[PDB]
């Protein structure tokens, strides 16, 4: 059974660092290509950020890029999110996701109408 | 609110998995060990069907192992004969896009779908001797995925919706309609008894679907990715499942869980349709790699390798009485295969 | 020795050809979709015309080269005459080949409407039909033998008439189509390597420009280095110059580049595919 | 409200699907066995067939 | 067996006036050029079928151009799920796709049209596939920049440290700060296809109107691109 658990966040101040967590249970870690995805309140889902097989390729998004470190571990089966440098204008929903293919380098997992490969993701919330 | 209703199911969940974990008793291959294992097998292409124009999508063996349907991106649905490579029926679509093909067990009708959520049943009396369109139904948000016929009066049809439902041709409308899906719904294998069926979706996870009641009975999530094609064992106590992870899967419905999963590490390609032979010793896998896996369901060791395709094997059908096995791929070629 | 030694270049250069045009026979023979296509035709009948080269021209004239005469007597005509329209259905094929490369690049959508398998087989046909009634018409009539061994003196009418019917109106129409060929190609290269440019920039074309000079340039210079000296001499010779064994030697070279004409017209991937699984050697 | 309706679906379900009798592995696979033992025989892929008989030569 | 050989005699008739409908269909179906129109719902797609013109899932048009037949396929009333259907559509001749830019809008819609067309490109099946990019609501654009700010240099920081190419050429009467933007959105979506390198399609930019009645000879010209290139590809001379 794919299941993923999205772990820390919560209510924290800007400028602050903060790190995720995502164990990703029930398949084989290094096939898949593996992302982060957020979504605002009243808006839709947005895409964070995306890691590759080996995890040698790495892009964000721009609004953001440099402030986010993603770590995949293969062996502790883990994909650990670093954040610093707080922004009030960010605060939202985080959301742990899996590309449906292995071997693969698209995803399409930008549908917002339960998707069903992602986590139940984690509320954090930045109060200035 | 939502957060002890998703506890609750998660302990339902766990409840579940210590029943799995209690009856897994032992495994299938250890108590196959002392079995006689059935050696390469060869099978070879006694006849190639031609004249399609564009990829063969899906396509339905009759049950009298003699006409076959083929539905293709050409717009044309055929009705082919086997046995003399002839054209008994050509049939112009409405809709070039076609997602797949029924044949009726007495034959006077077929089945067409596609992208344009609309399953067209086709009469074969031909009276005047033209085909015609006999009905459309509308009813799916969803595109058509896999349609398929328990007898002439009710077809069962698989929307891209995550829904699924039991159509009466007379009335036109929808018997029965199921929503239990999170992810969209490729493709569904009815029982030889006609009493359930099984879908495969999207999500990882394959239900078993009571008809008559209309409502799910078992969920299966073993799987990893996206599920393909689902096929009945034929004695209807067992199904079949294909994948994207490169990994068939083999479930029970008494015992609930997994009983055997088919994997090889040289061929990580994706699982397009899965058909059993007839003693069902035998499961027959069309690969994405141009070629078609013939499994020992038993022992899990590939026998034999149909690789006389040039493109790759789109979907895999066999006879009711065994006698060969058509693939048809995307290069336009239908081959019958025997052994 | 020195008799060993051209017969071993002599039949090598046999067994290359005839192996060659074998297995572009076969590969065509046994798959269907390497005769699906509507280009594919004009090969096949430069394959059949190259075979009908290595199986009517060169042996024969292999044996009197290497004996130093000619024992079959009234069999150099029908020779003469064979060579001739084997040589010419060669040539057109390769203008039949150069005008189809012209008309699938010039118009793109015109020519799925216009190249129906039915203009290909009356291009075949004129090609062939040009090549009998440049052969087995004035050969027969014998109206190049009579100017005043297998060694006929052509005359000047037939010599000037089949050497610029067989050589200097299909070379000028495959020079102004891949000189056109060229055109376009090298404004798409312009323009992909504009798109590359810009790449570039947003980041912060001479490789594949001169893969088209290296593929152009080799269509056109094997073809045309290989039959331009015999076609020098064949004008020179009836209005003088030249000894008989040069004449020879550049014969065989004429009819050497036959040879290399389907590893030339054969870099398909599909070929390549398919000679190996007729060859078997992969 | 809509979500907590389809959890509260899905906590419906798996009390539907928890509740059933479940046969142990190994009595399922010995009548498996017992099915593609008996029915071996009249397959015409695991065994193959004469050419006279087979309607395909 | 005289009436077997008479049920083989109808077999064989109706096998003829059936394969000679399908010759028939064969060359009316090699006549037809396929194209697959993607866009967001932001995006103004309905707009643009509106000019190509001048409940179902599938809506299906037919234009003709030089006497050359154009079938465009618009996904409807589809699921955003979009993986599973985009199969199908390799067999096309090639892919329109067409991305709105709003830069005076819930959420970023550009990352979304970037990551859209990733997808369709690294993907597998759609790597033989050309894609034809249409940049639409140029002149929102042109209205929306001066607003006193700007919403791209936000959204990315390489847009801060961006020049106008030399060799590109803007069109009187138009801002070089909207041009930048222009161009600088034309980058991004070209380093993604330059970044793949396969060489076996490539993504032709355009930039269009709101109510624009060009696009139709821009598709064919693209179509005459499209073609002559993998006949290049063909004989091997590129
Ligand atoms: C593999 C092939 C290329 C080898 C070819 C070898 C040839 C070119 C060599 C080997 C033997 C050589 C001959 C050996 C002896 C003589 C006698 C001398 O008074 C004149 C030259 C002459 C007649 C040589 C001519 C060149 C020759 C024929
Ligand atoms: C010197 C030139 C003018 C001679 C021209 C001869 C032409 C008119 C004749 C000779 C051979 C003939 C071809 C012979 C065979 C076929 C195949 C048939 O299925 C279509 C017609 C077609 C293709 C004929 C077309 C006309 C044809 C090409
Ligand atoms: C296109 C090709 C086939 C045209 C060929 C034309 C030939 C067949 C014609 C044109 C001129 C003709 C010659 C004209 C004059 C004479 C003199 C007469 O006392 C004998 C016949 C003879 C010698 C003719 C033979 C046939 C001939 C040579
Ligand atoms: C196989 C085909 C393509 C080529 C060989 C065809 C041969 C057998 C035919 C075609 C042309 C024919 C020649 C045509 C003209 C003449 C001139 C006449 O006064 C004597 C017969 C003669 C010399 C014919 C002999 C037989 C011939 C040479
Ligand atoms: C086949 C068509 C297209 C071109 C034919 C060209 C012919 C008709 C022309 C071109 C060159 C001409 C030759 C040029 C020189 C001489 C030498 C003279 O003392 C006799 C006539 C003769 C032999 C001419 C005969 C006619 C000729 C051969
Ligand atoms: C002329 C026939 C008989 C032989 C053909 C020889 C070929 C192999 C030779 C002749 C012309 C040569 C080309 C001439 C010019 C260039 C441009 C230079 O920047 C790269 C090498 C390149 C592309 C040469 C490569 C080799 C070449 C293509
Ligand atoms: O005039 C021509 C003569 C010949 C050919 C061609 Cl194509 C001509 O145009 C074909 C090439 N083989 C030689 C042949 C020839 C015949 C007799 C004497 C000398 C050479
Ligand atoms: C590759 C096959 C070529 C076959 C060519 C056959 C040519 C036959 C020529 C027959 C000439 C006979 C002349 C005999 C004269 C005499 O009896 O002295
Ligand atoms: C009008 C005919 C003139 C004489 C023809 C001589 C022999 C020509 C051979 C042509 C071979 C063409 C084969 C095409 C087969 C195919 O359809 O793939
Ligand atoms: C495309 C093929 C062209 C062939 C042209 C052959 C030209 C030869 C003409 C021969 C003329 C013979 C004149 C004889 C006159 C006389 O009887 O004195
Ligand atoms: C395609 C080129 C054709 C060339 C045809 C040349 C024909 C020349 C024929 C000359 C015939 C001379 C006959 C003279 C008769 C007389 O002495 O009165
Ligand atoms: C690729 C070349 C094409 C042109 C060929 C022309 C051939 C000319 C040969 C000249 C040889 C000179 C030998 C003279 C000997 C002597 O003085 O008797
Ligand atoms: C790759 C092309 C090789 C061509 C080989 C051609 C061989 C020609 C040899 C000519 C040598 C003539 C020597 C004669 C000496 C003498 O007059 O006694």
Same mark, same amino acid.
């Given at each position: 059974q794919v299941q993923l658990q999205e772990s820390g966040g919560g209510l924290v101040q800007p400028g602050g660092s903060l790190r995720l967590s995502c164990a990703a249970s029930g398949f084989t870690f290094s096939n898949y290509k593996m992302n982060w995805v957020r979504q605002a309140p009243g808006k839709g889902l947005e895409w964070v950020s995306d890691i590759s097989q080996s995890g040698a390729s790495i892009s964000y998004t721009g609004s953001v890029k440099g402030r986010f470190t993603i770590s995949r571990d293969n062996a502790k089966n883990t994909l650990y999110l670093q954040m610093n440098s707080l922004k009030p204008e960010d605060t939202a929903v985080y959301y742990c996701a899996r590309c449906p293919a292995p071997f693969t380098r698209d995803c399409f997992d930008v549908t917002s109408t339960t998707y069903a490969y992602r986590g139940q993701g984690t509320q954090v919330t930045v109060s200035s | 609110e939502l957060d002890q209703l998703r506890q609750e199911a998660e302990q339902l969940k766990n409840q579940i998995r210590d029943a799995r974990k209690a009856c897994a008793d032992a495994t299938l291959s250890q108590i196959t060990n002392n079995i006689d294992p059935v050696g390469r097998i060869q099978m070879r292409t006694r006849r190639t069907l031609r004249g399609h124009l564009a990829k063969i999508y899906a396509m339905h063996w009759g049950?009298?192992?003699?006409?076959?349907? #083929?539905?293709?991106?050409?717009?044309?649905?055929?009705?082919?004969?086997?046995?003399?490579?002839?054209?008994?029926?050509?049939?112009?679509?409405?809709?070039?896009?076609?997602?797949?093909?029924?044949?009726?067990?007495?034959?006077?009708?077929?089945?067409?779908?596609?992208?344009?959520? $609309?399953?067209?049943?086709?009469?074969?009396?031909?009276?005047?001797?033209?085909?015609?369109?006999?009905?459309?139904?509308?009813?799916?948000?969803?595109?058509?995925?896999?349609?398929?016929?328990?007898?002439?009066?009710?077809?069962?049809?698989? #929307?891209?919706?995550?829904?699924?439902?039991?159509?009466?041709?007379?009335?036109?409308?929808?018997?029965?309609?199921?929503?239990?899906?999170?992810?969209?719904?490729? #493709?569904?294998?009815?029982?030889?008894?006609?009493?359930?069926?099984?879908?495969?979706?999207?999500?990882?996870?394959?239900?078993?679907?009571?008809?008559?009641?209309?409502?799910?009975?078992?969920?299966?999530?073993?799987?990893?990715?996206?599920?393909?094609? $689902?096929?009945?064992?034929?004695?209807?106590?067992?199904?079949?499942?294909?994948?994207?992870?490169?990994?068939?899967?083999?479930?029970?419905?008494?015992?609930?869980?997994?009983?055997?999963?088919?994997?090889?590490?040289?061929?990580?390609?994706?699982?397009?349709?899965?058909?059993?032979?007839?003693?069902?010793?035998?499961?027959?896998?069309?690969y994405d790699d141009f070629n078609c896996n013939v499994w020992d369901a038993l022992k899990a060791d590939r026998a034999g390798v149909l690789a006389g395709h040039d493109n790759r094997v789109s979907c895999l059908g066999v006879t009711d009485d065994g006698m060969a096995v058509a693939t048809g791929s995307w290069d336009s070629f239908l081959k019958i295969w025997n052994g | 020795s020195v008799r060993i030694l051209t017969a071993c270049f002599l039949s090598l250069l046999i067994l290359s050809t005839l192996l060659g045009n074998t297995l572009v026979c076969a590969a065509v023979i046994r798959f269907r979709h390497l005769r699906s296509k509507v280009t594919n035709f004009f090969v096949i009948s430069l394959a059949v015309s190259d075979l009908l080269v290595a199986v009517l021209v060169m042996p024969w004239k292999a044996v009197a080269e290497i004996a130093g005469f000619w024992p079959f007597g009234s069999f150099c005509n029908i020779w003469v005459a064979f060579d001739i329209m084997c040589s010419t259905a060669s040539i057109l094929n390769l203008c039949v080949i150069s005008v189809d490369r012209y008309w699938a690049i010039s118009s793109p959508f015109r020519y799925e409407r216009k190249m129906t398998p039915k203009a290909a087989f009356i291009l075949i046909s004129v090609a062939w039909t040009l090549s009998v009634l440049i052969s087995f018409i004035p050969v027969q009539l014998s109206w190049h033998k009579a100017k005043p061994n297998c060694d006929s003196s052509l005359s000047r009418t037939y010599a000037i008439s089949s050497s610029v019917i067989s050589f200097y109106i299909p070379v000028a129409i495959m020079i102004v189509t891949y000189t056109r060929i060229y055109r376009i190609a090298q404004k798409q290269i312009r323009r992909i390597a504009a798109l590359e440019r810009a790449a570039v920039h947003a980041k912060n074309s001479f490789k594949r420009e001169t893969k088209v000079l290296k593929t152009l340039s080799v269509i056109m210079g094997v073809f045309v280095c290989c039959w331009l000296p015999f076609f020098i001499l064949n004008c020179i010779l009836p209005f003088c110059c030249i000894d008989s064994n040069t004449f020879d030697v550049f014969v065989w070279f004429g009819w050497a580049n036959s040879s290399l004409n389907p590893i030339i017209y054969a870099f398909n991937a599909d070929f390549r595919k398919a000679f190996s699984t007729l060859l078997g050697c992969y | 409200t809509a979500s907590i309706a389809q959890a509260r679906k899905l906590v419906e379900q798996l009390k539907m699907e928890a509740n059933i009798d479940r046969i142990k592995v190994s009595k399922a696979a010995a009548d498996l066995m017992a099915y593609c033992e008996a029915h071996a025989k009249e397959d015409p892929l695991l065994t193959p067939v004469p050419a006279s008989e087979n309607p395909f030569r | 067996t005289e009436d077997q050989r008479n049920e083989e005699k109808a077999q064989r008739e109706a096998n003829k006036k059936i394969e000679k409908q399908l010759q028939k269909d064969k060359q009316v179906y090699r006549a037809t050029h396929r194209l697959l129109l993607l866009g967001?719902?932001?995006?103004?797609?309905?707009?643009?079928?509106?000019?190509?013109?001048?409940?179902?899932?599938?809506?299906?048009?037919?234009?003709?151009? !030089?006497?050359?037949?154009?079938?465009?396929?618009?996904?409807?009333?589809?699921?955003?799920?979009?993986?599973?259907?985009?199969?199908?559509?390799?067999?096309?001749?090639?892919?329109?796709?067409?991305?709105?830019?709003?830069?005076?809008?819930?959420?970023?819609?550009?990352?979304?049209?970037?990551?859209?067309?990733?997808?369709?490109?690294?993907?597998?099946?759609?790597?033989?596939?050309?894609?034809?990019?249409?940049?639409?609501?140029? !002149?929102?654009?042109?209205?929306?920049?001066?607003?006193?700010?700007?919403?791209?240099? !936000?959204?990315?920081?390489?847009?801060?440290?961006?020049?106008?190419?030399?060799?590109?050429?803007?069109?009187?009467?138009?801002?070089?700060?909207?041009?930048?933007?222009?161009?600088?959105?034309?980058?991004?979506?070209?380093?993604?296809?330059?970044?793949?390198?396969?060489?076996?399609?490539?993504?032709?930019?355009?930039?269009?109107?709101?109510?624009?009645?060009?696009?139709?000879?821009?598709?064919?010209?693209?179509?005459?691109?499209?073609?002559?290139?993998?006949?290049?590809?063909?004989?091997?001379?590129?």
């Open positions: - | 049950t009298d192992s003699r006409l076959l349907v #083929s539905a293709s991106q050409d717009g044309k649905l055929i009705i082919w004969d086997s046995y003399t490579t002839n054209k008994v029926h050509a049939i112009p679509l409405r809709s070039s896009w076609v997602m797949t093909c029924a044949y009726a067990p007495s034959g006077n009708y077929v089945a067409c779908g596609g992208l344009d959520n $609309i399953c067209s049943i086709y009469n074969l009396k031909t009276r005047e001797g033209n085909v015609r369109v006999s009905r459309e139904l509308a009813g799916h948000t969803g595109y058509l995925s896999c349609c398929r016929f328990l007898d002439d009066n009710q077809i069962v049809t698989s #929307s891209g919706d995550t829904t699924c439902a039991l159509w009466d041709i007379e009335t036109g409308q929808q018997t029965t309609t199921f929503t239990g899906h999170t992810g969209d719904v490729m #493709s569904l294998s009815l029982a030889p008894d006609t009493r359930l069926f099984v879908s495969g979706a999207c999500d990882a996870s394959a239900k078993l679907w009571d008809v008559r009641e209309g409502m799910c009975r078992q969920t299966f999530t073993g799987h990893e990715s996206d599920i393909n094609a $689902i096929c009945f064992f034929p004695n209807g106590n067992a199904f079949a499942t294909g994948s994207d992870d490169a990994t068939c899967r083999l479930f029970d419905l008494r015992a609930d869980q997994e009983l055997m999963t088919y994997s090889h590490d040289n061929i990580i390609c994706g699982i397009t349709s899965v058909s059993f032979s007839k003693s069902g010793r035998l499961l027959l896998a069309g | - | - | 967001a719902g932001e995006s103004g797609k309905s707009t643009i079928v509106k000019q190509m013109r001048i409940t179902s899932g599938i809506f299906e048009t037919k234009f003709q151009v !030089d006497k050359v037949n154009f079938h465009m396929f618009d996904v409807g009333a589809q699921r955003d799920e979009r993986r599973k259907w985009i199969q199908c559509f390799n067999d096309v001749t090639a892919i329109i796709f067409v991305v709105a830019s709003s830069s005076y809008n819930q959420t970023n819609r550009l990352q979304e049209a970037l990551n859209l067309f990733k997808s369709i490109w690294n993907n597998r099946w759609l790597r033989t596939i050309s894609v034809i990019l249409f940049l639409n609501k140029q !002149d929102l654009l042109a209205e929306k920049v001066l607003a006193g700010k700007s919403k791209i240099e !936000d959204y990315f920081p390489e847009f801060a440290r961006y020049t106008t190419p030399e060799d590109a050429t803007p069109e009187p009467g138009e801002d070089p700060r909207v041009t930048r933007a222009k161009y600088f959105i034309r980058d991004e979506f070209l380093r993604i296809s330059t970044a793949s390198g396969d060489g076996r399609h490539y993504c032709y930019p355009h930039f269009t109107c709101s109510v624009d009645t060009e696009n139709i000879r821009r598709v064919f010209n693209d179509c005459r691109d499209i073609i002559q290139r993998m006949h290049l590809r063909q004989y091997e001379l590129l």
